[PDB]
Design a protein around this ligand. Structure first.
Ligand SMILES: O=C1CCCN1Nc1cc(Nc2ccc3[nH]ncc3c2)ncn1
Length: 167
């Protein structure tokens, strides 16, 4: 039993809700919140911009030190950093950005990072400003993640379409 409330159950392990991931994180304080990161951990917009804003830019400060030490992430890769005031940990995961020409096959590799964590709050990878089809992202999530994932979808219209089209 966990504190996630109001989710629709899609499969044994995947749950979905129309919610602002920022507000959801502040309420549950999950062990892991997933960020829709880029390889430079530049949290300018989309989910990342919103999460970072909620940390008063502390996420960005921490991320800049991470990059200075380690260099950029790989597309499809991840790193674990602090969750600041939102969660114990933030799993920064880089899905492919279609608006940069990146290979959509890397979306499966991106979701594989979730399997290293028993329970996660997450957005749909490569959705929004990353330019992928969210219906496809949900399909890859369900077919790749085996741990317990609670998906937050900001747009109500999109949430309803994802549910109504789910196989
Ligand atoms: O819906 C999708 C599909 C893929 C990415 N994506 N976005 C989100 C957004 C979100 N929260 C949010 C929304 C608007 C905001 N403005 N300022 C802060 C802030 C926070 N929570 C979950 N997914």
């Amino acid at each position: 039993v966990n504190s996630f409330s109001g989710y629709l159950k899609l499969t044994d392990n995947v749950y979905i809700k129309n919610a602002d991931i920022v507000e959801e994180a502040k309420k549950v304080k999950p062990t892991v919140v997933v960020n829709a990161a880029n390889v430079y951990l530049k949290h300018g917009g989309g989910v990342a911009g919103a999460l970072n804003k909620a940390t008063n830019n502390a996420m960005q400060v921490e991320s800049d030190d991470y990059i200075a030490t380690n260099g950029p992430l790989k597309v499809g890769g991840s790193c674990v950093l602090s969750g600041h005031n939102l969660a114990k940990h933030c799993l920064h995961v880089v899905g492919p950005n279609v608006n940069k020409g990146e290979d959509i096959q890397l979306l499966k590799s991106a979701y594989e990072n979730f399997n290293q964590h028993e329970v996660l709050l997450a957005p749909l990878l490569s959705a929004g400003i990353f330019g992928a089809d969210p219906i496809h992202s949900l399909r890859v999530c369900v077919d790749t993640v085996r741990t317990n994932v609670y998906l937050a979808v900001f747009d109500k219209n999109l949430y309803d379409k994802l549910v109504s089209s789910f196989l």
